[model samples]
Target: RPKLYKVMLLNDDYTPREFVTVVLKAVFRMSEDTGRRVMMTAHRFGSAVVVVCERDIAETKAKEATDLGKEAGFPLMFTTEPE
Candidate 1:
């Protein structure tokens, strides 16, 4: 069986909604509408699944998103879990 990892965005009160949307789009190559939906969903639910992929890809993507958040001085974070 193949292994997969779930990458999730953890909520932060200070991360601007627009920034989150932009990060989602940039990190995941998501459509604007899809990014908005994920951003809003995470905002509402306090977290949202960003992607599911092989471990290395998931880690890289999550790190990229985290780095973007850090570069922008936001507390936005992403985590990976077994799936």
Candidate 2:
């Protein structure tokens, strides 16, 4: 099985879904449509796995998402899991 991970957005009514989409597109390098879909998933489900990768790589990407969120004044949260 492959390593597993998730890039999730922290819950907050203040952050719009569009912003989440933008973040996913920018930070995770997802296409605009995919970003929007993931953003919606996160909004409805409280979180979503925007990407899945190898352990270290996924961890690094998750960290990158957090850093990007911090820099962008968002509380975006992400994590990893073994699969």
Candidate 3:
């Protein structure tokens, strides 16, 4: 199997959990339930993998997350890791 990259969303105190769910849905293409699950996972574990993809796709998703966070007036931060 090919290696994959993880797009992980880092939790922050200032960003509302609902907004995080929204971002997850909008950017990660997660279903509503999946987004909420990810949100709760982050809440409980401090961060979670919102998506897994190829390297370029992961980078693009991370960049899109950053841009969306800016547009939404939140400092959403996402990072990538090998998986």
Candidate 4:
């Protein structure tokens, strides 16, 4: 529990919803339905926890996911926070 961290997706106006869901699916390996759910939730709520895990994995995955958006030219952001 002490080492737990949250990998979260931040909502932004420029990024397409479809892009968000696709990133979620590819990075987290989530099903289409679940990816949609996560994407929508973040859109409405401002942010959503994509996953909770140990620090290294959470940070690494968050960086990779954020970079995906960077390459796509969107402000689509993923951040990791200690839980």
Top-scoring candidate (TM-score): 4
Order of the predicted models by TM-score, top scorer first = 4, 1, 3, 2
lDDT of each residue in 5-79, candidate 3, tens digit only:
999888877778888888888887888899889888878898888888998889999998877777878887888
Please provide TM-scores, in order, for all candidate models, with all chains considered together. Answer: 0.94, 0.77, 0.86, 0.95
Each model's lDDT: 0.91, 0.73, 0.85, 0.93
- Model 1: per-residue Cα lDDT over 1-83, one tens digit each: 77999999888899998898889988899988999898888899988999999999999999999999998898999889997
What local lDDT does model 4 show for residue 55?
92
Q: lDDT of model 2 at residue 74?
A: 71
Model 4, runs deviating above 4 Å = none
What pairs collide in candidate 4? none
Angstrom error of the Cα, residue 22, model 2: value is: 1.7
Give a tens-digit lDDT track for model 2, residues 1-83: 76565444555666667777777787788898998888778777777777777888888877887776677787766677655
lDDT by residue for model 4 over 1-83, one digit each (tens)?
45899999999999999988989999999989999999999999999999999999999999999999999898999999986
Weakest lDDT window of 10 consecutive positions for candidate 1: 74-83
**True-structure Cα RMSD, model 4:** 1.1
Clashes of 3: 0
lDDT of 2: 0.73
Q: After superposition, how far is residue 47 of candidate 4 from its true place, in Å?
A: 0.6
> Candidate 1: lDDT over CA atoms?
0.91
The per-residue C-alpha lDDT of model 2 at residue 78 equals 67
Error of 4 at 28 (Å): 0.2
